[PDB]
Design an enzyme around this catalytic site. Structure first.
Site, PDB file in Angstrom:
ATOM      1  N   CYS A  30       0.700   0.235  35.163  1.00 43.62           N
ATOM      2  CA  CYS A  30       0.307  -0.628  34.011  1.00 43.62           C
ATOM      3  C   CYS A  30      -0.119   0.248  32.814  1.00 43.62           C
ATOM      4  O   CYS A  30       0.051  -0.179  31.646  1.00 43.62           O
ATOM      5  CB  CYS A  30      -0.766  -1.631  34.414  1.00 43.62           C
ATOM      6  N   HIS A 200      -7.614  -1.770  34.671  1.00 47.01           N
ATOM      7  CA  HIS A 200      -6.292  -2.381  34.428  1.00 47.01           C
ATOM      8  C   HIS A 200      -5.936  -2.249  32.946  1.00 47.01           C
ATOM      9  O   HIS A 200      -6.786  -2.588  32.103  1.00 47.01           O
ATOM     10  CB  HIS A 200      -6.293  -3.838  34.869  1.00 47.01           C
ATOM     11  N   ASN A 220       0.070  -9.329  30.241  1.00 42.75           N
ATOM     12  CA  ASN A 220       0.030  -8.565  31.508  1.00 42.75           C
ATOM     13  C   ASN A 220       1.454  -8.063  31.774  1.00 42.75           C
ATOM     14  O   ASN A 220       2.373  -8.547  31.137  1.00 42.75           O
ATOM     15  CB  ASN A 220      -0.584  -9.423  32.632  1.00 42.75           C
TER      16      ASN A 220
HETATM   17  C1  LIG Z   1      -1.983  -1.008  36.773  1.00 39.76           C
HETATM   18  O1  LIG Z   1      -0.949  -0.631  37.291  1.00 39.76           O
HETATM   19  N1  LIG Z   1      -2.909  -1.611  37.441  1.00 39.76           N
HETATM   20  C2  LIG Z   1      -2.716  -1.801  38.911  1.00 39.76           C
HETATM   21  C3  LIG Z   1      -4.035  -1.982  39.613  1.00 39.76           C
HETATM   22  C4  LIG Z   1      -4.825  -3.201  39.178  1.00 39.76           C
HETATM   23  C5  LIG Z   1      -6.298  -2.853  39.373  1.00 39.76           C
HETATM   24  C6  LIG Z   1      -7.231  -3.969  39.811  1.00 39.76           C
HETATM   25  C7  LIG Z   1      -6.615  -5.006  40.746  1.00 39.76           C
HETATM   26  C8  LIG Z   1      -5.411  -5.553  40.006  1.00 39.76           C
HETATM   27  C9  LIG Z   1      -4.390  -4.412  39.993  1.00 39.76           C
HETATM   28  C10 LIG Z   1      -1.780  -3.001  39.143  1.00 39.76           C
HETATM   29  O2  LIG Z   1      -1.550  -3.783  38.239  1.00 39.76           O
HETATM   30  N2  LIG Z   1      -1.182  -3.083  40.314  1.00 39.76           N
HETATM   31  C11 LIG Z   1      -0.156  -4.096  40.523  1.00 39.76           C
HETATM   32  C12 LIG Z   1       1.042  -3.502  41.336  1.00 39.76           C
HETATM   33  C13 LIG Z   1       0.701  -3.085  42.738  1.00 39.76           C
HETATM   34  C14 LIG Z   1       0.584  -4.060  43.745  1.00 39.76           C
HETATM   35  C15 LIG Z   1       0.279  -3.695  45.044  1.00 39.76           C
HETATM   36  C16 LIG Z   1       0.087  -2.364  45.340  1.00 39.76           C
HETATM   37  C17 LIG Z   1       0.212  -1.372  44.346  1.00 39.76           C
HETATM   38  C18 LIG Z   1       0.511  -1.722  43.033  1.00 39.76           C
HETATM   39  C19 LIG Z   1      -0.661  -5.393  41.189  1.00 39.76           C
HETATM   40  O3  LIG Z   1       0.171  -6.343  41.148  1.00 39.76           O
HETATM   41  O4  LIG Z   1      -1.815  -5.417  41.627  1.00 39.76           O
END
Ligand SMILES: *C(=O)N[C@@H](CC1CCCCC1)C(=O)N[C@@H](Cc1ccccc1)C(=O)O
EC number: 3.4.22.1
Length: 255
Positions: A30, A200, A220
């Site tokens: 992200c 995020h 998002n």
């Molecule tokens: C940016 O990439 N942020 C990632 C972590 C966030 C931090 C807090 C919880 C919400 C997620 C993110 O957006 N991750 C995505 C993709 C993902 C899904 C599962 C495992 C690894 C990455 C997400 O949809 O949570």
């Protein structure tokens, strides 16, 4: 001077990227998505819609290296925009779009929501830096680079962030996600329940007021079936979950 509401999609209606929600896939990219979305928008604003391109999340994710962080295992906006000033970014659209030089290589998935795609999983490897465009694309990888003039932190100030968007276009930001955020559907998000999940990175493209609640208009990178067609609103004016504390932007170089 500043209007009560602003929506970058209305101010720059010939810039379709401002309207477009991306899907980061099973990858913690992200940090890269908020950057290349806001940069795409700003290239189109900077040129009065004479240049309108999808900037490659792939190129940023895979070629920035340790400067930006750990690729799919997370990274940081400020160094993303610095990379854009130093090495530039090529074009590239959505997974199997065949749009631009380096379209995103990670398939779309369901982000904390039901639908027809596979659920998003963790432990994605970062793809390798490939300095070549998809077969048949013109021009060369080196020729397709779009560079930043500069990168900068916007001050932790509601009015400065509003003025930045109003003048120069959408920005990247970062905030603390609590578990209640994952179930967002509509209205103005405020943290009411749930534990801290982590930081995020998102794109802020406007502001408004809904039921006397001031909000930021935010894209998002979880596809359009998450949230309000992929967008959400978050409380504005109280540095809510740190939404005003990590804003980054930059001015494009005329190609
Ligand atoms: C940016 O990439 N942020 C990632 C972590 C966030 C931090 C807090 C919880 C919400 C997620 C993110 O957006 N991750 C995505 C993709 C993902 C899904 C599962 C495992 C690894 C990455 C997400 O949809 O949570």
């Amino acid at each position: 001077k500043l209007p009560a509401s602003f929506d970058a999609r209305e101010q720059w209606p010939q810039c379709p990227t401002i309207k477009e929600i991306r899907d980061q896939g099973s990858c913690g990219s992200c940090w890269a998505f908020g950057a290349v979305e806001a940069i795409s928008d700003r290239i189109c604003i900077h040129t009065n819609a004479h240049v309108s391109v999808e900037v490659s999340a792939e190129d940023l994710l895979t070629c920035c290296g340790s400067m930006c962080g750990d690729g799919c295992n997370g990274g940081y906006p400020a160094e993303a925009w610095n990379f854009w000033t130093r090495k530039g970014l090529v074009s590239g659209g959505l997974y199997e779009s065949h749009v631009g030089c380096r379209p995103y290589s990670i398939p779309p998935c369901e982000h904390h929501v039901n639908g027809a795609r596979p659920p998003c999983t963790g432990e994605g490897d970062t793809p390798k830096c490939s300095k070549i465009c998809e077969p048949g694309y013109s021009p060369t990888y080196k020729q397709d680079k779009h560079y930043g003039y500069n990168s900068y932190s916007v001050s932790n100030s509601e009015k400065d962030i509003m003025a930045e968007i109003y003048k120069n276009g959408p920005v990247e930001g970062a905030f603390s996600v609590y578990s209640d955020f994952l179930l967002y559907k509509s209205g103005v998000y405020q943290h009411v329940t749930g534990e801290m999940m982590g930081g995020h990175a998102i794109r802020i493209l406007g502001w408004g007021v809904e039921n006397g609640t001031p909000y930021w208009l935010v894209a998002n990178s979880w596809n359009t079936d998450w949230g309000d067609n992929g967008f959400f609103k978050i409380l504005r004016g109280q540095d809510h979950c740190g939404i005003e504390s990590e804003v980054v932007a930059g001015i494009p170089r005329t190609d």
